[model samples]
Target chain A: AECSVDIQGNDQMQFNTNAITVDKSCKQFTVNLSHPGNLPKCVMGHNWVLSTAADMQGVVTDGMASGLDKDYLKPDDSRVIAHTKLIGSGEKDSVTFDVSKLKEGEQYMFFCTFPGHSALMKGTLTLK
Target chain B: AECSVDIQGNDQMQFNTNAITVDKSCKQFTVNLSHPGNLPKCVMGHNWVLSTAADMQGVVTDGMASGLDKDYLKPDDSRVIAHTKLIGSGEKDSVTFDVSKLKEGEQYMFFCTFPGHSALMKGTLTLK
Candidate 1:
């Protein structure tokens, strides 16, 4: 729908989906994430972030400095292509970006920047 | 300060103190980090993280998964020796760890896990 994707994050530190594809015909793409877990944001929060596969690590690294108030993202970081707010159990959030931000042949990734979550919560995104 | 050290992180991505030594007699060692820049933590936040030099990259790598809510740290990660909260310009934070965690002649490292900051904000910690 509107070239968008939906994913789920649970207390188990996982995403219901990994690989994502964006339709080239769409001018913009969106990612919707829902957390079914019961824990609060302080102990178990989740967010959706998109960037180059290579930039994922760097984005996560610098985001640590921003703290939770900034949704685990560096403020105004150019590396971030798009991101959603950090959500807790039963919460959900989404992020949208211009399809033009993505390019052919470049590898992309969607992940959760919640400490220790990325190692297990990441998947590939590509233009189709 | 008993086997403690003071370090400064600047906007240029640097640490004023690069190498630190902890006397074997000290029971605990502390690190004090000051940011002299005017940028708020949202822009140029900094923190001090410590682990074996070998664990530095891995820690930074996984800490990204932790998000800022956990201070960019994985909750209860055994690999971390110590760490401080993320702070911004004109702010300060400190961390202390048991001296017993260090072994004579073993190499340790101190760095900021603020995303891209680790690539430039790091130094050596050794037990003397």
Candidate 2:
């Protein structure tokens, strides 16, 4: 149960990989994300936010209004299981969450909360 | 070719369709774009701009700075063959350009210049 994963965000609003599986033996899991484009965060910023599929819309709606400084997410958002900081091109961020917090049968999704990016820039997370 | 196409942009930052082909007999071609999502333009606004695929990055970079009022596009941008106004969900915009204006050899691309949406919300234009 020891595992770690790296995810990527490109200028095209897509994640290089769509499904992230966690090792059951790992005490905790880490999600590392990097942006490879050169555009400034204001023009093409991206972030990785984790929540159940059901919480996606609400988190994004509120996050859209949260402004850039908060990384387009609510401060201490309870709904977010884990999230990397907002990053522009050439920047990176990582988040670690307890594996015990995840359970089978629950749907989890990771997405970019950069205003309008979540629609195409989202994926599922699961424990395997 | 005599034809018209209606395109949809949703809160998801994606076009309902990709690869718009114009009929050869139509003297002029029209592209109609609409947004069905409910977010405001500043947060989730989308626009359709047409340019040579080669000009994509430059147009996008400059348009990103042109502000929302300009529909996130440069005003009188010669590189742009045609474009619609920027809109939020529940709004619509349209533009018409002469089919003859588009040469057969040049590659054309359509994109949403609403900040980060372009990566997932772009497509090609072809003459048939």
Candidate 3:
């Protein structure tokens, strides 16, 4: 299992893919993000966030209140396992997390915490 | 063909469906929106807006800057054919527009103007 993966977001408010795999043999996993749209971050921003499926709703709600200045995430929020910075078109960001954060039987999710994006930008993450 | 439709938005930032049809004989078309989640409007708000597919991006861009007090829409934006006020969980809103606004072969779009919402909350509307 590779320790790194790449994902993309676009001005269309969509991700290029809907699922990601983290190899269990890796001690760490890195997620790379890209935005291919033309809109600026303020108008159509995107980010990648990781958490348990159960924590997604709460994280998105709190992140919206935190606003864009905080990259649409609650500061020091323990529920977040990994996250990338908010980005707009032609921008990129990446995040790495200790593989230990994931459990074999647990349901993990990755999404953009930007306002209404979680609904479309989310996907399942499984440890193989 | 009946010219009215009901749609639902949930805490997950999604619309229940992604396509709508309008009957050519109707003089007016109405859209009813509902939110079944428990979050407040400022947190997980939803709204419905109608415009040409070409105008969706610009409307969403300007609407994001307008903030929540304006229901996440630009005031008096002509690009918007119709829209509803932002509503929270368990709340509802509706909007109606003259069916004549839709062209026989044009691509019309309906979406939530809430920041980051247009990405996931958008759908296609057609005159049949």
Candidate 4:
């Protein structure tokens, strides 16, 4: 079986799964994101972006400036190893990145770039 | 002229305009709401719901269960004197209500019903 996974985000700036173990055998990994609230994208919009834990803030600050039309992310941001479109309640989006991009010793994390959400909408991404 | 007004919300769980001056001479008043941040409403999700300060929690709790399809609001909620559909960054929405419903001594407020957001999002609505 492929090392595919699903993740859920809600209006509370929370992720159903904050930490996930990636299967070493998978060549590529997928993250499915969902926001189950009824609010629109502007009030509680959310998106998934992956980066080294240390680089998370830089990517988020830049993404905030990029606006929603660009999915609330910077244009071709190299810091973003992988990401998904910003979505509102009942909306879902996903992103896939090659396993090769992950380094076993390095610390990586995933979070929503939706402004204030990063504080609560973040989780550790581990390579085992 | 109608009692038209504008309000703004951002990724910070704040509204740009608080205590909007409603033109008492008009039969109706309108509120224009905007969220400038690129984030969607689900993470830092926000919405505008006007009610007597006492009823805020009830509306919020009920809206949370309704899910995002209903814009984070309950169906036919009588306490909501007025409200607008939840929106995301660069998105705008408006709501209008009759002036007679607002009495001079009653205490009212407007806020986002996106789960935890109301704690930081609420503002007073006064009738003078």
Best-fitting candidate, scored by DockQ: 3
- TM-scores for chain B, listed for all candidates: 0.92, 0.96, 0.96, 0.91
Candidate-wise lDDT, in order: 0.81, 0.84, 0.87, 0.81
The interface RMSD for candidate 3 is 8.1
Off by over 4 Å in 4: B1-128
RMSD of 1: 13.9
Tens-digit lDDT string for candidate 1 (A38-93): 87885568898989998988887677667778877888889889888999998888
Between candidates 1 and 2, name the one with more favorable lDDT: 2
TM-score attained by model 3: 0.56
When superposed on Cα atoms, how far off is each prediction in RMSD? Answer: 13.9, 12.0, 11.5, 12.6
Name the better of 1 and 2 by TM-score.
2
Q: Write the per-residue lDDT of candidate 3 for residues B15-117, one digit (tens) a residue.
A: 9999999999899999999999887887578898889999998898788878888988888999998888999999998888899878898899999887677
- Tell me, by lDDT, which candidate is best: 3
DockQ of 3: 0.17
Q: Higher DockQ: candidate 2 or 4?
A: 2
Q: Tell me how each candidate scores on DockQ against the true complex.
A: 0.04, 0.10, 0.17, 0.07
lDDT of 3 at A27: 97
TM per candidate comes to 0.53, 0.56, 0.56, 0.55
Local accuracy of candidate 2 as per-residue lDDT tens digits, B25-95: 98898988899988788767888899999998878867876877787888898999899999887898888
User: Candidate 2 residues A1-128, lDDT tens each?
Assistant: 25778888876567888788887788899888899986778767888898999999889878977989899999888999888899988999888999888887789998999876775688899988
